[PDB]
Design a protein around this ligand. Structure first.
Ligand SMILES: C[C@H](O)c1ccc([N+](=O)[O-])cc1
Ligand SMILES: [Mg+2]
Lengths: 151, 151
């Protein structure tokens, strides 16, 4: 296991712990992981953090009615690059009509990048992932873990 | 002004905007600024961030009942080094008796370092600063600004 691989495992553990905490409490969240398509244009719309990842910071960011909670967190590798970021809204007809702006923003960025976006619904606590224009809903903890390890 | 001078003033504005936000809402806070005495031993007790300063991130860290709100933020080299850090509690018999652990921790670190620590009381929203073993209480925004500019 190289340092790079161990660091990736720590980041996935941090992300999965934060998502699970937020799902249980119905804390809405929108977390985009940059991949090979650069997302600088969207990172620059938010508040710069350039912070080391932790489950604790991810949770603190999304607490309702706080300065950082509204908009997307964008991660670059093992860092939280910015919070409260703008993402474009998808007009796909395959987004469940009951879903709100977080899910439409997630699918939107997924249509113009190869990023992976995780959404927690503030209505149900359900966890979904947007990738390549598709939204995959109602994920188990195990399924989320898988998708991140494969990414 | 020089890039170093403009960066210092931005940081002072970010700090004062956050302190004022938390004073109004009586959100307890503990923010230590490292000076010439290195504080690595204390930084290592918290959650690593190495994040850029913003008023928004400072506010989000100290939201009550969150992972990061318990303990001190330590700033170093114009970044937020870590949150939820341990600081030593003063045994000084000359701290106002109505004050609790946040203020004793601020005075305590100020007895063994040249650091400047800002405290917001969760009981009153009063703002105070610890330096050289003394606590300066009931500060206005202008008074805090002057201390930060003097530092
Ligand atoms: C930022 C500054 O220290 C300060 C801001 C606001 C208050 N107050 O509402 O009383 C006190 C002190
Ligand atoms: Mg299903």
């Amino acid at each position: 296991p190289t340092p790079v691989e161990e660091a990736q495992q720590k980041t996935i553990e941090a992300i999965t712990k934060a998502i699970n905490y937020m799902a249980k409490r119905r804390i809405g969240a929108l977390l985009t992981i940059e991949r090979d398509t650069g997302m600088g244009d969207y990172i620059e719309t938010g508040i710069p953090l350039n912070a080391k990842v932790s489950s604790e910071l991810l949770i603190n960011i999304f607490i309702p009615n706080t300065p950082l909670h509204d908009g997307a967190v964008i991660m670059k590798n093992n860092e939280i690059a910015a919070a409260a970021c703008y993402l474009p809204l998808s007009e796909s007809p395959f987004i469940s009509k009951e879903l709100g702006t977080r899910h439409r923003a997630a699918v939107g960025i997924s249509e113009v990048t190869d990023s992976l976006t995780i959404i927690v619904s503030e209505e149900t606590g359900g966890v979904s992932v947007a990738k390549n224009g598709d939204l995959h809903r109602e994920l188990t903890e195990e399924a989320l873990k898988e998708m991140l390890e494969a990414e």
